[PDB]
Amino acid sequence: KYRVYLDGTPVGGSKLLSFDLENLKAGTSYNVQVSQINGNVESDKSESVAFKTTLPK
Amino acid sequence: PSGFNVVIEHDSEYQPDVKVTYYKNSIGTEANGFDTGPVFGGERIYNLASSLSYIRNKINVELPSVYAMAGEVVNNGNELLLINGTEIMRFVIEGATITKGYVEKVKPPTNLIVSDVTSTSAKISWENG
Amino acid sequence: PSGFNVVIEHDSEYQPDVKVTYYKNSIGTEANGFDTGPVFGGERIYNLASSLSYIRNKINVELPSVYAMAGEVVNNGNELLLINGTEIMRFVIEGATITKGYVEKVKPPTNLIVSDVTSTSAKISWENG
Amino acid sequence: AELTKITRGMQNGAETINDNLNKLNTITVQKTGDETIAGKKTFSGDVSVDGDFTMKKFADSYVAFFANKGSGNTVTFTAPWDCTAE
Numbered sequence: 001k002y003r004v005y006l007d008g009t010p011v012g013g014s015k016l017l018s019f020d021l022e023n024l025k026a027g028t029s030y031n032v033q034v035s036q037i038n039g040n041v042e043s044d045k046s047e048s049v050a051f052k053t054t055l056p057k
Numbered sequence: 058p059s060g061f062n063v064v065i066e067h068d069s070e071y072q073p074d075v076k077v078t079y080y081k082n083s084i085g086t087e088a089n090g091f092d093t094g095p096v097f098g099g100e101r102i103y104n105l106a107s108s109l110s111y112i113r114n115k116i117n118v119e120l121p122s123v124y125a126m127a128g129e130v131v132n133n134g135n136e137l138l139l140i141n142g143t144e145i146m147r148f149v150i151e152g153a154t155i156t157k158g159y160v161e162k163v164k165p166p167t168n169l170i171v172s173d174v175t176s177t178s179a180k181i182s183w184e185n186g
Numbered sequence: 187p188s189g190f191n192v193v194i195e196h197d198s199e200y201q202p203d204v205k206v207t208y209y210k211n212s213i214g215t216e217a218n219g220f221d222t223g224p225v226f227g228g229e230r231i232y233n234l235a236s237s238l239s240y241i242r243n244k245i246n247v248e249l250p251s252v253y254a255m256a257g258e259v260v261n262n263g264n265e266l267l268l269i270n271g272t273e274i275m276r277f278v279i280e281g282a283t284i285t286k287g288y289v290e291k292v293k294p295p296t297n298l299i300v301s302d303v304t305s306t307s308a309k310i311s312w313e314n315g
Numbered sequence: 316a317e318l319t320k321i322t323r324g325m326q327n328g329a330e331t332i333n334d335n336l337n338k339l340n341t342i343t344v345q346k347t348g349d350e351t352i353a354g355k356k357t358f359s360g361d362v363s364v365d366g367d368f369t370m371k372k373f374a375d376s377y378v379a380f381f382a383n384k385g386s387g388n389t390v391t392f393t394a395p396w397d398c399t400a401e
Contacts, residue, residue, distance in 0.1 A: 002166065004181060008224040017166075018182040026176035029217045031224045034166040034183050041163050044112055046183065048210060048224050049169035050217065050272070056176045070330045072207075072231055110232045112225075207326060214323030227329030260324065267324045274324045 003035045005045060013037070027055040058186055060108075061125035062161040063146075065116040065137060069153035075118050076149045077105035086143050094143075105146070117161065118148060132158050187315055189237075190254035191290040192275075194245040194266060198282035204247050205278045206234035215272050223272075234275070246290065247277060261287050316342050 003013045006021060007030060013019065024030065029052045036043040067073055080102045082094035094100070108119040128141030137158035139146040148158070164186025173180040196202055209231045211223035223229070237248040257270030266287035268275040277287070293315025302309040318335045325331065344352055370376075381392040 002183070005224060007222070008226075017184060018180060021179045021181055022177070024177055024179065030179070031211075031217075032169065032171070032181050033224055034169065034181065036163050036166060036186065038163045043161075043163040043165045043186065044115065044117070044230075045225075046166040046169060048229060049171060049181070051171040051174055051179055053179065054174065054176050070333075071327060108233065108235065110230050112230055209326060212324050212326060213321070213328035213332075214325075228326065231326065262322060269324050274326075276324075276326055 001037055003037055003042065005033045005035070007031055024053050026053050028053055058164065058167075060119045060122045062164070063118040063120065063137075063139065063148065064159055064161045065118060065148060065150060065155055066114055066157040067116065067150060067153035067155055068114070070113065071152070072109075072111045073116060073153040074151040075107060075109055075116055076151075077107045077118065077120065078147045078149075079103045079105050079124070080145055080147070081143050083145055086140065086145060088143060114156070116150075127160075130158055130160070132156075187293065187296075189248045189251045191293070192247040192249065192266075192268065192277065193288055193290045194247060194277060194279060194284055195243055195286040196245065196279060196282035196284055197243070199242065200281070201238075201240045202245060202282040203280040204236060204238055204245055205280075206236045206247065206249065207276045207278075208232045208234050208253070209274055209276070210272050212274055215269065215274060217272060243285070245279075256289075259287055259289070261285075 001013075001015050002017075002019070003010050004019045004021070005011070011021065019034075021030070021032065029050060031048045031050050033045045033048040035045045065075060081100045082096060083099035084091065084097075087094040105120055105124060110117045110119070124146070126139065126141045126144060126146065128139050128144070128146075131138040131140060132155050134154050135150065137148040137150075137155050139148075139160070166183040167186055168182075168184045170182045171179050172182060194204060210229045211225060212228035213220065213226075216223040234249055234253060239246045239248070253275070255268065255270045255273060255275065257268050257273070257275075260267040260269060261284050263283050264279065266277040266279075266284050268277075268289070295312040296315055297311075297313045299311045300308050301311060316338060318338060319331050321328065321331060321335070344350060379395055379398075381390055383390045
């Protein structure tokens, strides 16, 4: 029911209202936006949200 | 949600302006056939206040939720018409040609929250439009 | 107070029009450098509803308090840009040249009341903007 | 050629870049294909034409004939351009 775009490219999706972004690199900024799927009818992409992975010790 | 949204797809690589009007019983929408209405040609024309936002080739015309209506969509290229019986909501584009137009049914997700963020991962959660 | 106010100083002896838009990740505002954003060229462009008022050479662009943002002010003469990281609020003037532009920090007084009025005097009281 | 300035934070960056690239592509003289070039073109250095060289009014512009009609013994003339006489 949803398509998850990390930095403009799709990385997966879900039936649920949550998704786990994996294989990211430490201390880097990212942007994520989600769209809704309804049988080959895709909504416009959502407003982007920005986050940054933590740095390891 | 935010309102009633009408999507206008066009051929410009830019941000065309849209002007919204509303009117009842214009020619061809009268219930009992041509010229059976109370004011031949159409009753009071109201200018509808819209909030416009743009992506490449797609204008999103956000109107107050109170104007929300069903109806047939007619694309005349220069203008789009949302015809519901006797009622018409007219959208006039400037500087482009209307390719396709429709009431936004599949709406974009909303409250994007990044949680459980580590060096290698994060969890993205949202709410349906 | 009333809202978020952006002042645009110009060279016209008249009342130039101003059109406000908002957009994220336009070229040069991406966090990780050129073309590192999710939508090259810029995400959704929103038209911002403004309430304009004028004095000689100074336009006051009143925007809803919810849009209030910090940021660097860039004056390109034809347009003013309020750049805050990834976010841009664009102000396009019509019929004049932008001389200087800035978020109104020193704001005019408000509730002017004339009290204790006699034949030779009066007391003027007000409230900070 | 008037190109529209590409600035940081500009609203239609992608569209203006495309436009400027398209302007340059259609106004420039290129190293390939058949073309028509307007304007006075002054070449500082050497020029070589391996193909067919077409010239408008070569005769009048590079050759000149001067002779005395009434006597035929003494020809007096003003040299139109630096040359070689026969």
